[PDB]
Amino acid sequence: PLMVKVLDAVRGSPAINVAVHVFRKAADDTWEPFASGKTSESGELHGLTTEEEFVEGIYKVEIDTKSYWKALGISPFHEHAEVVFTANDSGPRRYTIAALLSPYSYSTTAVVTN
Amino acid sequence: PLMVKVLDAVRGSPAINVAVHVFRKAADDTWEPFASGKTSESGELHGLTTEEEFVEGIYKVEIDTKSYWKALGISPFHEHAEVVFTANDSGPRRYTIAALLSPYSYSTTAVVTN
Amino acid sequence: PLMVKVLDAVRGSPAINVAVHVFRKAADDTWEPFASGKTSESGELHGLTTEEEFVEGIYKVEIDTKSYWKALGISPFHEHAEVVFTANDSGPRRYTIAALLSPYSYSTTAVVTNP
Amino acid sequence: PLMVKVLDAVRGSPAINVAVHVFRKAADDTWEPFASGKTSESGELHGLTTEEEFVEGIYKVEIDTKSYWKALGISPFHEHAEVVFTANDSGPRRYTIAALLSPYSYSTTAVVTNP
Ligand SMILES: Oc1c(Br)cc(-c2nc3ccccc3o2)cc1Br
Numbered sequence: 001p002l003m004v005k006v007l008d009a010v011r012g013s014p015a016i017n018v019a020v021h022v023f024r025k026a027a028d029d030t031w032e033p034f035a036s037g038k039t040s041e042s043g044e045l046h047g048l049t050t051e052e053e054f055v056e057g058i059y060k061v062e063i064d065t066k067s068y069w070k071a072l073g074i075s076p077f078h079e080h081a082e083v084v085f086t087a088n089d090s091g092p093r094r095y096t097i098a099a100l101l102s103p104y105s106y107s108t109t110a111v112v113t114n
Numbered sequence: 115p116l117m118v119k120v121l122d123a124v125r126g127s128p129a130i131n132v133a134v135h136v137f138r139k140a141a142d143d144t145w146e147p148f149a150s151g152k153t154s155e156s157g158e159l160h161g162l163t164t165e166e167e168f169v170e171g172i173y174k175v176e177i178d179t180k181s182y183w184k185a186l187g188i189s190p191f192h193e194h195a196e197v198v199f200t201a202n203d204s205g206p207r208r209y210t211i212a213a214l215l216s217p218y219s220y221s222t223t224a225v226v227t228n
Numbered sequence: 229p230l231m232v233k234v235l236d237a238v239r240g241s242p243a244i245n246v247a248v249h250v251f252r253k254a255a256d257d258t259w260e261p262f263a264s265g266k267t268s269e270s271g272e273l274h275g276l277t278t279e280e281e282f283v284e285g286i287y288k289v290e291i292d293t294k295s296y297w298k299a300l301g302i303s304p305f306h307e308h309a310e311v312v313f314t315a316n317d318s319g320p321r322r323y324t325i326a327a328l329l330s331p332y333s334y335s336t337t338a339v340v341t342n343p
Numbered sequence: 344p345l346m347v348k349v350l351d352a353v354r355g356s357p358a359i360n361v362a363v364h365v366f367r368k369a370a371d372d373t374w375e376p377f378a379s380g381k382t383s384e385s386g387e388l389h390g391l392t393t394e395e396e397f398v399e400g401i402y403k404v405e406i407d408t409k410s411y412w413k414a415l416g417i418s419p420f421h422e423h424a425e426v427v428f429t430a431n432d433s434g435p436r437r438y439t440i441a442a443l444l445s446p447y448s449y450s451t452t453a454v455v456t457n458p
């Protein structure tokens with residue numbers, strides 16, 4: 001139900017081997033680790049969770065953009081990119097969180113489908 | 115070698131049934147029709163061309179954003195969105211032109227892979 | 229030395245009355261409140277800090293996009309937009325944090341100048 | 344009534360000395376030159392037109408992004424960024440066309456105000 005895709009606006013390519021961490025907001029308002037992985041050669045990270053585990057709640061997707069740029073020898077602005085959203089069962093069932101990265105900028109969108 | 119994908123930033127969805135026209139620049143600098151189609155339910159338009167036909171050159175991808183917004187009952191800013199680029203054989207072989215649409219804004223990127 | 233500008237990609241307008249909260253990472257790795265305000269009729273928020281107060285550190289600029297969209301009677305995707313960055317680590321700079329908002333998307337950029 | 348602002352997402356800076364050409368669609372459906380200029384050290388291009396001259400029409404703002412990137416010694420994807428829109432069809436408005444540039448991507452937005 002959740003896929004993350006990361007793209008590079010400098011090289012015009014998928015952003016490969018980017019660390020991504022997903023958190024769920026707990027009842028005490030702390031962020032609890034939920035899922036993580038590294039983007040593939042296509043810039044995508046599949047298999048983070050299952051329908052059963054991905055209950056309604058507030059989730060945070062943290063993308064380690066700083067390490068990505070540093071590996072390329074480029075000095076970046078942001079410590080990371082954070083995407084925070086509510087999963088809602090009323091809405092469609094599959095969520096794609098996409099991020100387009102530049103050293104001093106990023107764009108993110110959600111594609112939510114049934 | 116060429117795919118076009120269009121996304122909607124207002125609804126968080128693929129932009130479905132969007133007309134897309136591709137042109138190649140001719141030797142007299144006019145734009146000659148090359149390929150066209152309508153995005154699918156996934157927001158993607160596949161099958162525009164073949165490796166044989168897609169020779170080095172300057173290409174224009176025109177996306178009929180105004181009709182898309184009007185069909186949704188939303189007043190848009192742009193007449194259309196234009197993406198103009200050189201296809202170069204030195205670079206990687208497959209080109210994805212992606213566009214993220216809002217009524218008064220759009221973002222575009224190229225994902226170019228081998 | 230810190231300005232925040234917010235635009236609305238649906239209306240083609242400044243995003244007015246957007247709440248913005250800035251935090252600085254403390255010695256104990258917690259986010260300490262640093263400054264806050266609301267965007268003006270131009271979509272800009274000036275006067276958050278001074279060059280004396282805006283020392284080296286890791287800062288988080290949280291833009292309350294959800295509250296913005298709800299109030300235009302609209303249900304958006306994100307809770308907020310957060311921008312996290314190290315500032316002033318090579319001496320004082322001036323920072324503009326710009327954000328362009330849609331209900332299911334935002335884009336952010338920084339303009340960093342040396343006075 | 345027409346301003347163009349261009350930012351650089353690689354450098355985190357205004358995009359300076361970017362050439363901008365504006366066209367208006369003529370009665371015969373050709374693009375007629377309307378105005379042109381270069382962005383300043385702030386990334387802004389003011390003074391393109393007057394409210395008298397900037398009548399109703401379909402306008403194209405062409406931003407010469409390729410020439411910008413080449414000159415920073417860099418090979419970019421797009422030939423230019425073009426923004427095409429109807430203007431002043433409900434009377435005079437003020438238009439800001441903003442563009443945020445990367446070598447393989449750009450984003451553009453409009454801010455339209457009623458004076
Ligand atoms: O499967 C995808 C998805 Br999901 C998002 C994008 C995408 N996300 C974007 C954000 C700003 C500009 C262009 C963008 O393209 C591209 C491809 Br290909």
Ligand SMILES: Oc1c(Br)cc(-c2nc3ccccc3o2)cc1Br
Pocket residue numbers: 233235324326327328335336337339348439441442443450451452454
């Ligand atoms: O005075 C401006 C204007 Br107009 C637009 C922008 C701007 N345009 C943007 C497009 C995408 C992401 C961030 C953006 O910021 C910034 C400033 Br500062």
